[PDB]
Every structure is written in structure tokens, then in C-alpha cells.
């Protein structure tokens with residue numbers, strides 16, 4: 651049993667809810683919250699900007715030190731950093747950004763990072779300002795992630811379309 655409430659069950663291991671991932675993280679304090687990161691861990695907008703704002707910029711300060719030591723992530727890659735006030739850990743995952751011309755086949759590689767964690771609160775990778783089709787992102791998620799993933803979808807209209815169209 652876990653703390654996640656109000657989710658619709660899509661599969662054995664994937665759950666979905668219309669929710670603000672920031673507000674959900676603050677309520678649940680999950681072991682792992684996933685960030686929709688870029689390779690520079692520059693948390694300007696979208697899910698990343700919202701998560702970072704909720705940490706009062708502490709996520710960005712920690713991220714800048716990580717990049718200064720390690721250099722940029724790979725598209726499709728990830729790193730584990732603090733969850734600050736939102737979670738124990740933040741898994742920063744880089745999905746391909748269609749608005750930069752990145753290979754959408756890298757979306758499966760991105761979701762494979764989730765399999766290193768038994769339970770996660772996450773957004774749909776490469777959705778929103780990363781430009782991918784969220785219906786496609788949900789299909790890759792279901793077909794790639796084997797661990798237990800609780801997906802937060804900010805937009806109510808999109809949430810209803812994802813559920814209604816789910817095969």
C-alpha cells in the first residue's frame with residue numbers, strides 16, 4: 651500500500667491523475683519525484699521551472715554545482731539529486747525536445763531510467779513545452795516502465811483525452 655490517492659489505474663503498474671505535480675509532491679512527499687529536465691539542468695519553465703520555484707531555487711543551485719562538476723546530461727539520460735522540500739530524491743530525466751529537433755526514439759531510453767526506482771511520481775516525458783504528442787508519451791511509458799509510476803497531468807482537458815483514448 652502507498653499514499654497516492656485519486657489515481658485511475660491504467661495497467662498493472664501505471665496510474666494517472668489530473669494534478670499539479672508540485673502540489674502532489676508537497677502532499678505525498680514521495681521517495682522519487684521526476685523532473686522534466688534538460689541536459690544543462692536549467693529549470694526555466696514547464697514542469698522544471700515549477701518544481702524549481704517550489705524549492706525557492708535550491709534545486710537550481712544544487713543543479714548548477716552538479717553541472718560544474720559533471721558536465722551536461724545526455725538526451726535520454728538522468729541523474730539523481732535532492733528532492734528538497736518536495737520528495738526524498740528528484741530524478742532529473744531528459745526526454746527529447748521536439749522544439750530542438752531531438753530523436754523521439756530517445757523517449758524510450760528516457761523512460762528506462764524510471765525502472766531504477768520502485769515507485770515514482772512523474773510527468774509525461776517530452777510533453778508540454780518539449781513538443782511531443784502526450785498520447786505517444788503515455789504509450790511509451792506504459793510499454794517501457796515496469797516499476798510503479800504515478801503520472802500527474804496538469805491540464806484537465808489533456809487528462810480526459812489521455813484516459814478516453816487509452817488502449
Ligand SMILES: O=C(Nc1nccs1)c1ccccc1
Nearest residue numbers: 781782783784805807808811
Ligand atoms: O499538445 C498536444 N495535444 C494536446 N491535447 C490536449 C491538450 S494538448 C500535442 C503536442 C504535439 C503533437 C500532438 C499533440
